[PDB]
Design a protein around this motif. Structure first.
Motif, PDB file in Angstrom:
ATOM      1  N   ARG A  60      15.200  19.535  34.110  1.00  0.00           N
ATOM      2  CA  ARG A  60      15.485  20.896  33.673  1.00  0.00           C
ATOM      3  C   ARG A  60      14.615  21.868  34.460  1.00  0.00           C
ATOM      4  NH1 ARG A  60      18.805  17.844  31.765  1.00  0.00           N
ATOM      5  NH2 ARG A  60      19.306  17.597  29.541  1.00  0.00           N
ATOM      6  N   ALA A  61      15.090  23.104  34.589  1.00  0.00           N
ATOM      7  CA  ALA A  61      14.398  24.138  35.350  1.00  0.00           C
ATOM      8  C   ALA A  61      13.679  25.106  34.418  1.00  0.00           C
ATOM      9  CB  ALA A  61      15.379  24.910  36.234  1.00  0.00           C
ATOM     10  N   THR A  63      10.758  28.622  34.558  1.00  0.00           N
ATOM     11  CA  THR A  63      10.134  29.639  35.393  1.00  0.00           C
ATOM     12  C   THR A  63       8.616  29.580  35.277  1.00  0.00           C
ATOM     13  OG1 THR A  63      12.060  31.082  35.092  1.00  0.00           O
ATOM     14  CG2 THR A  63      10.020  32.118  35.864  1.00  0.00           C
ATOM     15  N   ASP A  65       7.169  29.181  30.085  1.00  0.00           N
ATOM     16  CA  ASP A  65       7.553  29.623  28.749  1.00  0.00           C
ATOM     17  C   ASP A  65       8.905  29.017  28.402  1.00  0.00           C
ATOM     18  OD1 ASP A  65       5.251  31.080  28.925  1.00  0.00           O
ATOM     19  OD2 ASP A  65       6.202  33.050  28.759  1.00  0.00           O
ATOM     20  N   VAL A 104      12.069  28.184  25.571  1.00  0.00           N
ATOM     21  CA  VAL A 104      12.784  28.623  24.379  1.00  0.00           C
ATOM     22  C   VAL A 104      13.073  27.419  23.496  1.00  0.00           C
ATOM     23  CG1 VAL A 104      14.967  29.546  23.533  1.00  0.00           C
ATOM     24  CG2 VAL A 104      13.776  30.682  25.430  1.00  0.00           C
ATOM     25  N   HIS A 153      15.493  26.400  21.396  1.00  0.00           N
ATOM     26  CA  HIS A 153      16.861  26.796  21.107  1.00  0.00           C
ATOM     27  C   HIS A 153      17.522  25.827  20.128  1.00  0.00           C
ATOM     28  CE1 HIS A 153      17.711  23.686  24.101  1.00  0.00           C
ATOM     29  NE2 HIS A 153      16.882  24.327  24.905  1.00  0.00           N
ATOM     30  N   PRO A 157      21.467  24.200  19.307  1.00  0.00           N
ATOM     31  CA  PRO A 157      20.835  22.884  19.153  1.00  0.00           C
ATOM     32  C   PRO A 157      19.746  22.624  20.190  1.00  0.00           C
ATOM     33  CG  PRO A 157      23.241  22.721  19.148  1.00  0.00           C
ATOM     34  CD  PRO A 157      22.893  24.080  19.654  1.00  0.00           C
ATOM     35  N   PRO A 174      16.352  17.789  25.390  1.00  0.00           N
ATOM     36  CA  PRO A 174      15.114  17.074  25.750  1.00  0.00           C
ATOM     37  C   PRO A 174      13.955  17.996  26.087  1.00  0.00           C
ATOM     38  CG  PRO A 174      17.002  16.050  26.798  1.00  0.00           C
ATOM     39  CD  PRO A 174      17.517  17.300  26.148  1.00  0.00           C
ATOM     40  N   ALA A 175      14.220  19.115  26.764  1.00  0.00           N
ATOM     41  CA  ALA A 175      13.136  19.986  27.209  1.00  0.00           C
ATOM     42  C   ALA A 175      12.550  20.783  26.049  1.00  0.00           C
ATOM     43  CB  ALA A 175      13.634  20.919  28.310  1.00  0.00           C
ATOM     44  N   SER A 176      13.408  21.374  25.213  1.00  0.00           N
ATOM     45  CA  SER A 176      12.908  22.148  24.083  1.00  0.00           C
ATOM     46  C   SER A 176      12.271  21.252  23.028  1.00  0.00           C
ATOM     47  CB  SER A 176      14.032  22.983  23.466  1.00  0.00           C
ATOM     48  OG  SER A 176      14.992  22.155  22.834  1.00  0.00           O
ATOM     49  N   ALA A 182      16.176  32.814  27.766  1.00  0.00           N
ATOM     50  CA  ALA A 182      15.897  31.783  28.762  1.00  0.00           C
ATOM     51  C   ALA A 182      15.468  32.391  30.092  1.00  0.00           C
ATOM     52  CB  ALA A 182      17.120  30.884  28.947  1.00  0.00           C
ATOM     53  N   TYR A 210      21.670  30.224  33.853  1.00  0.00           N
ATOM     54  CA  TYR A 210      20.470  29.508  33.440  1.00  0.00           C
ATOM     55  C   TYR A 210      20.759  28.400  32.437  1.00  0.00           C
ATOM     56  CZ  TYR A 210      16.802  32.133  35.846  1.00  0.00           C
ATOM     57  OH  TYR A 210      15.966  32.656  36.808  1.00  0.00           O
ATOM     58  N   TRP A 211      21.850  28.501  31.682  1.00  0.00           N
ATOM     59  CA  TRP A 211      22.254  27.431  30.780  1.00  0.00           C
ATOM     60  C   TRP A 211      23.742  27.577  30.493  1.00  0.00           C
ATOM     61  CZ3 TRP A 211      23.670  28.324  25.494  1.00  0.00           C
ATOM     62  CH2 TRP A 211      23.510  29.647  25.064  1.00  0.00           C
ATOM     63  N   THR A 212      24.288  26.586  29.794  1.00  0.00           N
ATOM     64  CA  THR A 212      25.705  26.549  29.458  1.00  0.00           C
ATOM     65  C   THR A 212      25.854  26.215  27.982  1.00  0.00           C
ATOM     66  OG1 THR A 212      26.202  25.803  31.704  1.00  0.00           O
ATOM     67  CG2 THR A 212      27.946  25.584  30.057  1.00  0.00           C
ATOM     68  N   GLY A 217      27.019  24.669  24.662  1.00  0.00           N
ATOM     69  CA  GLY A 217      27.609  23.398  24.296  1.00  0.00           C
ATOM     70  C   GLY A 217      27.579  22.340  25.374  1.00  0.00           C
TER      71      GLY A 217
END
Ligand SMILES: Cc1cc2nc3c(=O)[nH]c(=O)nc-3n(C[C@H](O)[C@H](O)[C@H](O)COP(=O)(O)OP(=O)(O)OC[C@H]3O[C@@H](n4cnc5c(N)ncnc54)[C@H](O)[C@@H]3O)c2cc1C
Ligand SMILES: Cc1cc2nc3c(=O)[nH]c(=O)nc-3n(C[C@H](O)[C@H](O)[C@H](O)COP(=O)(O)OP(=O)(O)OC[C@H]3O[C@@H](n4cnc5c(N)ncnc54)[C@H](O)[C@@H]3O)c2cc1C
Lengths: 230, 230
Positions: B55-56, B58, B72, B74, B76, B78, B81-83, B125, B224-226, B228
């Motif tokens: 995952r990317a 900043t 930093d 988020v 989020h 649902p 793995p990263a959050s 994000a 930055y994300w999609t 679902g």
């Protein structure tokens, strides 16, 4: 009643954060260690005279059967007799220690008598005390930790782990910075333990009582050090 | 080439916004930090397997002399793995990080080559990236910021300060909400930086080109994300 203690080990927990291990076999007789329990030490004059300097330090390790114990000491700038001692003391040195003036921290027995959250406020000097508190807070109670930062190395001082701990680091511009950093939220039924610098504690207590509406019985606040003074 | 990074600190900037501080001395050997610079992390499987998930994120803090840096993240819903990592990681954990594909943001040196304004579009994000942009935009250039909102706590995520910043928050009903929220005005010689959700970005790009008259080279758009989708 004081006791003689001999240094047995010294470990650098962080670049400016020193754990000193000592032994005093009679120290823990009838003296039970609690979160934030601390000791008074009579530190020697770095300049070589017979004058001694009493300073307080929190117990971070303890074994009552052997009298072995440890304290974590900030190497602060400017230095004082105690932090100079931490920097230069070697195993084999002796120092007088006393337990008097220390009230422990405890979570209420009944879960429905417990606070709905703990607000912990301090800095590097009260991190041993705050760590001891975090280690005994039940996992279902949230903890809002505010640490006034003085050096970049402060983030390297290890914090106790807790599943509901939220850490906030405060840059100190003046004595008003720590109180202003506190989140304005609903603090109902929270308990506050505060051990920050004396000048910052004054404005913190004023905010807790007047703006946050904290009762006296749900706040413990003690100045752990004073800027520019011993 | 990736580098091993060790987590040194975690701070809750907002209730759903976590700043994770790491150290990696070899990372900044070939990496220069610019506004919107980002890194690739290989996050562990929360369910405990050996599978890793790239995952990317900043760069929000950086010290090339020491290798310390922060991102930093988020929290989020649902979760992913990263959050989940952001929620559960403790200091002392390690993770592999890589700089690859990151292009920076810059303002033209010649004032007559600079945009007459900046149109910034994103959400929580892309707020770390957008903040870095705001911090370098000259004080005499207005900034029009649109942030698609996903939770009430999103207004607690700190934005960078700027004398000519005007913030606009957008409730998301579908992928068309963000584009429709953009003000219909003269955008001549403005520059647009957009890092929103993928579906929203599709309709934002179309409005920038078809209705606002943005040239392609005056637009940077990256999803930055999609919704679902991992
Ligand atoms: C109950 C209690 C428990 C404490 N437990 C601990 C502990 O576990 N670990 C720990 O490190 N400290 C602890 N402290 C704080 C410690 O006693 C003070 O920091 C003390 O002033 C240090 O003694 P000193 O001789 O080194 O400096 P002093 O002689 O008291 O002062 C000399 C100079 O150093 C400055 N200074 C003193 N302390 C600091 C500091 N933290 N940061 C920046 N500047 C400082 C002073 O402003 C002064 O200018 C505790 C204090 C109390 C009341
Ligand atoms: C260059 C670049 C830089 C980025 N920098 C940052 C940054 O600094 N801070 C940051 O928080 N994010 C940043 N992102 C976005 C981040 O990479 C994505 O949010 C990513 O999907 C998070 O990984 P994850 O494992 O938590 O969730 P995923 O496994 O990818 O997806 C899990 C579920 O959660 C949803 N989801 C994922 N992200 C979000 C989100 N923001 N909001 C709502 N739902 C979401 C997904 O739709 C999916 O359903 C960046 C993306 C890019 C391309």
């Amino acid at each position: 009643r004081d006791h003689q203690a001999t240094v047995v080990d010294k470990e650098y927990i962080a670049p400016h954060f020193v754990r000193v291990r000592l032994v005093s076999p009679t120290l823990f007789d009838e003296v039970i260690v609690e979160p934030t329990s601390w000791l008074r030490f009579w530190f020697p004059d770095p300049d070589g005279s017979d004058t001694e300097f009493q300073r307080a330090y929190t117990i971070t390790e303890s074994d009552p059967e052997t009298g072995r114990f440890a304290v974590d000491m900030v190497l602060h700038e400017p230095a004082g007799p105690a932090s100079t001692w931490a920097r230069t003391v070697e195993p084999g040195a002796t120092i007088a220690v006393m337990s008097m003036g220390s009230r422990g921290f405890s979570v209420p027995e009944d879960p429905e008598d417990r606070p709905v959250g703990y607000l912990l406020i301090g800095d590097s000097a009260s991190t041993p005390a705050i760590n001891g508190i975090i280690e005994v807070v039940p996992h279902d109670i949230p903890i809002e930790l505010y640490l006034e930062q003085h050096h970049d190395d402060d983030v390297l001082i290890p914090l106790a782990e807790h599943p509901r701990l939220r850490v906030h680091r405060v840059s100190r511009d003046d004595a008003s910075s720590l109180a202003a950093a506190l989140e304005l939220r609903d603090w109902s039924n929270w308990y506050c333990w505060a051990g920050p610098e004396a000048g910052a504690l004054k404005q913190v207590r004023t905010r807790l009582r007047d703006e946050f509406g904290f009762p006296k019985r749900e706040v413990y606040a003690q100045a752990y050090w004073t800027e520019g003074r011993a």
